[model samples]
Target: GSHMETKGVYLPKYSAELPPTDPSQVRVYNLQYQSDTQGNIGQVRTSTHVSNEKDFQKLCDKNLKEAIKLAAQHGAHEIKYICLYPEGQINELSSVQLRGYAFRD
Candidate 1:
């Protein structure tokens, strides 16, 4: 019998899987938000938010919420997010920079 080895270590192939989001259960930040919409209105409003959370993920999440709220006020129903941190690293102040776009339908 023949087996495969990697420098005395066995490495398994990996694939990433994301859970499905239900339309009815989707939130403003969820991927399935407005999944049933006919189409976007071809308009986008950009907004930014900065947060001071100790953890990078938490900081981005918090900033995203603010950006979404601002976008909603601009009459957008959907949003796109971008991370603006330098080298994807947060500073000692825990400041996180995020750019987001709000879409209308």
Candidate 2:
């Protein structure tokens, strides 16, 4: 019998077996909050606990709960998020840059 070998290793032939891609299982979500007034954190736009420090984090935590619920309903076992505070929109806020996080079973 003849066989192909490289670096003292034997390689097997390729097979036609392949996995299917289920797009329905993939999803993307965009959640944003805006502020209207200046100086003060509240009195702005959107449902925010406050426009300044302290409350901003709390607000995001609250809304994140909702986002998680939505992702669950949409068959998303993992979630990646990015929050932005547009320049000149909020108090010296430019954007909320979140690197990336993964949640899985």
Candidate 3:
């Protein structure tokens, strides 16, 4: 038997619409990006459900941006990495949860 199959791959999209105005001033990382932070201002969380993984990524981005904005609103100029949580399986529809922290250093 002969068949054609495509392996799936996905990577987070980084853009200016997110956070860390200055790469030198602030560092952007994932929850696993680092072990700890100088201080924690508060915790931020966001989530989104979409019919497609592509849309899920976009939603993730939106949620993260919103989280960062929220941190800023609370007077946090620095933030830890955004951690992702899978609400369920990925098929016709998928839900993703995000968690992170905002702080100042």
Candidate 4:
């Protein structure tokens, strides 16, 4: 199988346009991209579900641009982010993604 890795941002509290959140959770940031390399404004659209490596790479395709935009809003400086679906499952705890951007304002 091919190994695909995607990178983006994640925010706890997103926006109102999005669907309703779970009663227990008020906010969530599945994955996003760094808006700018000198800001901390990151944005997220939706969750990325992947069952295999190919799917993992595709996840970035749809959301990477948005994530980058939001990341700029949050503050980013030479943003360096990485997200991997280690378990490679659409629904699973091991199905986790991470992202971080360095900002120098």
Candidate 5:
């Protein structure tokens, strides 16, 4: 129906679905990066990447890698915000968490 009384339109929605791409393709950034990104954007976060109570620094580094791997699973071009001491400290182990926008533009 193309007439004035019957004309209609369907809005197109952004598609963020993706297969696991190269982890190198994912960029980790700050929240400011979210503002810099637009279109086909979604959210992604990694569960606690925990390690035995020892090298917190090294664990954080590895946590970032794990976060990137998660983003890559979604084929996200970028991710933001990494939490080292995510929820204070637990005497058992060092738990890390990270959040980011799965941006594809």
Candidate 6:
């Protein structure tokens, strides 16, 4: 399997097209990446359902990048958290999920 999946969950109450932010300028975090002055913006997620370790690695990295891109498109200043869940089942496609929250200070 060579597919990358992404999901963006934004605050629905005030839905509008937000100005894009720069991914390079955004700091990524494994924990809530924020200052006391910061506020939560949205969520960015990437999931890979794949083949071997090599392809899995490639897809995993690919998901991460697209996840960040999704965040930036939503105007998040930084990625609040990074979490990964990897699962395997008997004779099936391997699954790996990554999640990150977007925030602004």
Scored by TM-score, the top model is 6
Candidate 1 stretches with Cα past 4 Å from truth are 1-53, 88-90
What's the residue-level lDDT of 1 in candidate 6? 52
State residue 9's C-alpha deviation in candidate 6, in Å.
Answer: 6.1
The TM-score-based order of candidates, best leading, equals 6, 5, 3, 1, 4, 2
Model 6 over residues 35-86: C-alpha lDDT tens digits? Answer: 5224566667766655444555566566677777877878877875554655
For candidate 5, write residues 12-64 as lDDT tens digits. Answer: 13553566678897777765654554653565544443534365555555556
Which tens-of-lDDT digit does each residue in 1-105 have in candidate 2? 111111111111233222322324533343232221112111101222233454455444444444444434333344454443445555423223321122233
Q: What local lDDT score does residue 56 receive in model 2, on the 0 to 100 scale?
A: 51
Q: Pick by lDDT: which candidate is best?
A: 6
Candidate 1 worst ten-residue window by lDDT = 1-10
For model 5 the local lDDT of residue 15 reads 57
Score each candidate by Cα lDDT. Answer: 0.40, 0.32, 0.52, 0.41, 0.54, 0.63
> Between candidates 3 and 4, which one is better according to lDDT?
3
Models sorted by lDDT, best on top: 6, 5, 3, 4, 1, 2
Prediction-by-prediction clash tally: 0, 4, 2, 28, 0, 0
lDDT of 4 by residue, 11-101 (tens): 6333423332222222223325434324433323333444443454556544454445554454333334555445443542233444544
- Each model's TM-score? 0.46, 0.36, 0.58, 0.39, 0.59, 0.67
Q: Which residue pairs in model 2 clash with each other?
A: 36-44, 36-45, 41-51, 85-95
CA RMSD per model (angstroms): 18.2, 22.2, 11.2, 11.1, 16.0, 4.0
Model 5 superposed RMSD (Cα):
16.0
